[PDB]
Amino acid sequence: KIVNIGAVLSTRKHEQMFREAVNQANKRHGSWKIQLNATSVTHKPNAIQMALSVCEDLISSQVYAILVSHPPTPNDHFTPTPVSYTAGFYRIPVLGLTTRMSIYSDKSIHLSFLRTVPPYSHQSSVWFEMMRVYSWNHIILLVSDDHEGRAAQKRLETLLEERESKAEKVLQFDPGTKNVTALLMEAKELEARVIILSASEDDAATVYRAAAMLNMTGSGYVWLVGEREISGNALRYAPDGILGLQLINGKNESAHISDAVGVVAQAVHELLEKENITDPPRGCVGNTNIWKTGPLFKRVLMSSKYADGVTGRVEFNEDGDRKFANYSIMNLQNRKLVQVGIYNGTHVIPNDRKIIWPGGETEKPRGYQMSTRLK
Amino acid sequence: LNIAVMLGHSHDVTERELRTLWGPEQAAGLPLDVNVVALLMNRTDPKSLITHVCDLMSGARIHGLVFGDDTDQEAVAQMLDFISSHTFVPILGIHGGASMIMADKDPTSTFFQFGASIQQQATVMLKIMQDYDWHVFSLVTTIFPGYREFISFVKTTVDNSFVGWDMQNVITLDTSFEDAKTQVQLKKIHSSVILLYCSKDEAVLILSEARSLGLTGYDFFWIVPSLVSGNTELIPKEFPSGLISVSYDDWDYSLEARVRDGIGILTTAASSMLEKFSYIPEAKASCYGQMERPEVPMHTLHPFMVNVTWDGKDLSFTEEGYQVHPRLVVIVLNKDREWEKVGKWENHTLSLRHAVWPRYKSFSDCEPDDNHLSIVTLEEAPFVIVEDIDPLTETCVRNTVPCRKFVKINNSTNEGMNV
Amino acid sequence: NVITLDTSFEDAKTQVQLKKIHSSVILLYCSKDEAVLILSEARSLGLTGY
Amino acid sequence: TVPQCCYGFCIDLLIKLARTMNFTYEVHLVADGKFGTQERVNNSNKKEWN
Ligand SMILES: *[C@@H]1O[C@H](CO)[C@@H](O)[C@H](O)[C@H]1NC(C)=O
Ligand SMILES: *[C@@H]1O[C@H](CO)[C@@H](O)[C@H](O)[C@H]1NC(C)=O
Numbered sequence A: 001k002i003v004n005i006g007a008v009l010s011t012r013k014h015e016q017m018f019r020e021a022v023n024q025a026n027k028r029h030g031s032w033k034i035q036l037n038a039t040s041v042t043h044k045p046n047a048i049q050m051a052l053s054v055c056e057d058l059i060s061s062q063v064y065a066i067l068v069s070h071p072p073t074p075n076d077h078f079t080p081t082p083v084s085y086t087a088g089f090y091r092i093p094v095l096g097l098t099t100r101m102s103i104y105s106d107k108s109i110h111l112s113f114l115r116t117v118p119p120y121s122h123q124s125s126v127w128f129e130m131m132r133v134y135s136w137n138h139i140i141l142l143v144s145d146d147h148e149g150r151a152a153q154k155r156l157e158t159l160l161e162e163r164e165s166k167a168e169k170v171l172q173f174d175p176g177t178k179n180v181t182a183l184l185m186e187a188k189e190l191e192a193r194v195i196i197l198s199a200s201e202d203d204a205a206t207v208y209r210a211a212a213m214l215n216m217t218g219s220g221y222v223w224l225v226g227e228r229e230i231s232g233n234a235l236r237y238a239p240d241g242i243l244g245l246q247l248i249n250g251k252n253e254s255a256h257i258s259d260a261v262g263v264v265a266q267a268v269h270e271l272l273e274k275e276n277i278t279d280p281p282r283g284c285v286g287n288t289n290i291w292k293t294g295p296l297f298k299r300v301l302m303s304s305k306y307a308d309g310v311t312g313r314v315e316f317n318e319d320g321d322r323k324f325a326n327y328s329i330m331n332l333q334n335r336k337l338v339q340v341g342i343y344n345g346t347h348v349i350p351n352d353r354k355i356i357w358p359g360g361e362t363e364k365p366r367g368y369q370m371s372t373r374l375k
Numbered sequence B: 001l002n003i004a005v006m007l008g009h010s011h012d013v014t015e016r017e018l019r020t021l022w023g024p025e026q027a028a029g030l031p032l033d034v035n036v037v038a039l040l041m042n043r044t045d046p047k048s049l050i051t052h053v054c055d056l057m058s059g060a061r062i063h064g065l066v067f068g069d070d071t072d073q074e075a076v077a078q079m080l081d082f083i084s085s086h087t088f089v090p091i092l093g094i095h096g097g098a099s100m101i102m103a104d105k106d107p108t109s110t111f112f113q114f115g116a117s118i119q120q121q122a123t124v125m126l127k128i129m130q131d132y133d134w135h136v137f138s139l140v141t142t143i144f145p146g147y148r149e150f151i152s153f154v155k156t157t158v159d160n161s162f163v164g165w166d167m168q169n170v171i172t173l174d175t176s177f178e179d180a181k182t183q184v185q186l187k188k189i190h191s192s193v194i195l196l197y198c199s200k201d202e203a204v205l206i207l208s209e210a211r212s213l214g215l216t217g218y219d220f221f222w223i224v225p226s227l228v229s230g231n232t233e234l235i236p237k238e239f240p241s242g243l244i245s246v247s248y249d250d251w252d253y254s255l256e257a258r259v260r261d262g263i264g265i266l267t268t269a270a271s272s273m274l275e276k277f278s279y280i281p282e283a284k285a286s287c288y289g290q291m292e293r294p295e296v297p298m299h300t301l302h303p304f305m306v307n308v309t310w311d312g313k314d315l316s317f318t319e320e321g322y323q324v325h326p327r328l329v330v331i332v333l334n335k336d337r338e339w340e341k342v343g344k345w346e347n348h349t350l351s352l353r354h355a356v357w358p359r360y361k362s363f364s365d366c367e368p369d370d371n372h373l374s375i376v377t378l379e380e381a382p383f384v385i386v387e388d389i390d391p392l393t394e395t396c397v398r399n400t401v402p403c404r405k406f407v408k409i410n411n412s413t414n415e416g417m418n419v
Numbered sequence C: 001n002v003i004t005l006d007t008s009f010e011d012a013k014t015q016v017q018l019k020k021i022h023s024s025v026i027l028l029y030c031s032k033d034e035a036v037l038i039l040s041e042a043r044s045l046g047l048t049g050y
Numbered sequence D: 001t002v003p004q005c006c007y008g009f010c011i012d013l014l015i016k017l018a019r020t021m022n023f024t025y026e027v028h029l030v031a032d033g034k035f036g037t038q039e040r041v042n043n044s045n046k047k048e049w050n
């Protein structure tokens, strides 16, 4: 009953602090008798050597779960696709920490990928809650021609079908486009005056600059902006009146790991209490078979509940991602982010700070006017 | 300039190498001859695969890799995704583990596979329904990745269909092994044709539950997609017959036949590149390293592989990479639990059948029945005014039952199609 | 046609027998003890509708 | 798109509606010239209105 859980961490300091954390958690109840032997692989901007290190440090060991962290440099994307691709052979459940991309939401792309961070498409729930608590009926959607944007649009439509409403117009962007005047004018020539933005940081900054240049930052125009579209150059070239979103304690890698390692340690013994299991192959080449406990891991993990985590209960949805994540509605006041709304699960909690609006409005506007311009 | 083809232990290595050598030498000789490197290897392990890909890439800059397999693991295509993303080389999919396609094509990937997507089989299923004149739908699905968009697409297609099919609410299986809510979910199924957008393992249990509920009667019909019926030689005892399915198995094609089409597509792409550009493409300095920045100054091959025509066979591809004219032959489980080809779809994206559908006997249980009462009618008196049908993407006029009649072609030939 | 319950606690043929019931008014010629189980099975099959 | 001059019963009704319902309109003309039905275009399986 010797398990050797591997990990993929960023730097040596992380490799030491997280090893100390898992060593401490070994004796924090959970499993019984002996515990797991932990190991880590440093993050590398190269692929071949990183894959070889992963094979020589995890596959040779008795790995039942994989800890994958965010890239050390946030400027690059460096999606953790290869680790999930390798784990797909044996249905190895990897544990993403802050990978917020919507590519990993569906398990069709990655056979066995689990993360404690909600996908980008989960912002649709926050937007729907805000609309239902602020009495919004007509909404237009502006999403780029990306897989994450399409997933967000589909989620928004499916969640909006409950009220039997319908979006007015849907506008598409491009990964690198600069001239958005046509679509901006198309959005302007509409009854609704509320726009949802979900795209890359550079595209969001460019479209926001175009909107500011074309008088779209005035009174009566409420903007809904995602989490990743408020950082970078947005906080520098964006005036007040923007309702951003941020995850509470979502960026704390140490806090996420301190719960994920306990969850996987308890799940290992939960599976051990079940029938016999299948060990990973020793050599990276020499066994092309597939695990029989792969679906068992998903079955014992979807229904698992852990209230001992830092962020409270850690529940997994049908896609295996974080459920009821703690969101925080942001608001920009004099180029300073002010916390207004608190969203733990299916509930928004406004704060005593007044919700300002573009154009210096202290009251909630609406786009219910027809403008008497019926062609 | 160089083509690499990977095979397995299914056949002999020497004959495969000889056939791959003879491939480009059949017709349409390239201005720059391309060689073939066929290695008999069954090691589908990701590390072995990536090492072999690196060795081939270092092999005088191979500009084309053909990936074959003999197992049923889909992770080979998953590793091929990363391989194509980090190598930027066009790769063609052949029969094997990579036959099934379920992941969206990455923008940096150059994949053009022979498999058909779910949306590409929905039209075939709709044409089959048109041919069978079954206007009632019952979609029994399960919570799986990517199925919500498939359901939305099929709902939009049936809404945009001019026939006006009945579309009941889709009954999805929330949680497996409930044993309590399963009966409540199944109580809402009251139809004759049932669609199973599920997996093999859960579909076996779903059909077992239907048999326990007696949903495999004479009037009941089932349609099976390619993924569920992928393993033709794995027929569980709980599967009732009469499963009309669409697939592209090797019953009408071979690995050699598919690699011939692949090398033809490669030749067409090379000809297009030579027509447009005049510089031979080159790979990265390293085989799998990223010491330098990953950039591709040369234009991608996606625009050059759109109008792919080979000997009159339009092997074109869409923007995603899926085929436009796939195989998608029609198969159905026989009385003795065998699958036979009873239709094709290559003819201008149109579905034609063998005009044979007598499979009505109960398979899950043993209960004879007599429902289809054949009626003989002659058209000589003003009591039957049967005429032709209007070619408007619909069966015929409303509130009228369909029939059939033999049509004679020649005074000597007695063959008559069942129009 | 009348559908009778051959043997109690079959758990296999009960669903086959109940599958043929498609109506709004159902006659139950049984006893209390087995009628409780029959109605529980109907509830599991959702036969207690409006 | 030259400026024409159209009038009739429907336009008079539209004027009455505009006067009694706070409307300011600019009337256009149909480019196709038909009421609008189902036409056949590439991918004919899609119901597009003209
Ligand atoms: C954990 O496993 C690795 C790989 O097998 C090994 O090198 C290491 O020594 C093990 N840890 C301990 C404490 O022995
Ligand atoms: C953007 O496109 C519009 C066409 O709608 C054109 O009038 C405008 O000049 C373009 N702007 C730039 C900067 O290309």
Ligand SMILES: *[C@@H]1O[C@H](CO)[C@@H](O)[C@H](O)[C@H]1NC(C)=O
Binding pocket: A213, A214, A215
């Ligand atoms: C925005 O509108 C105001 C008045 O409506 C005008 O003075 C100003 O010039 C406009 N902005 C731009 C960039 O033209």
Ligand SMILES: *[C@@H]1O[C@H](CO)[C@@H](O)[C@H](O)[C@H]1NC(C)=O
Binding pocket: A252, A254, A255
């Ligand atoms: C993460 O959480 C721990 C525990 O509350 C805290 O000590 C630490 O400062 C947090 N990290 C950051 C970056 O706030």
Ligand SMILES: *[C@@H]1O[C@H](CO)[C@@H](O)[C@H](O)[C@H]1NC(C)=O
Binding pocket: A312, A344, A345, A347, A348, A349
């Ligand atoms: C989540 O927020 C709601 C606010 O409506 C509150 O009632 C609930 O107790 C909160 N739950 C947790 C676990 O904090």
Ligand SMILES: *[C@@H]1O[C@H](CO)[C@@H](O)[C@H](O)[C@H]1NC(C)=O
Binding pocket: D022
């Ligand atoms: C609307 O119509 C009323 C007529 O009762 C008129 O007094 C008012 O000025 C109109 N308002 C506008 C904006 O046309």
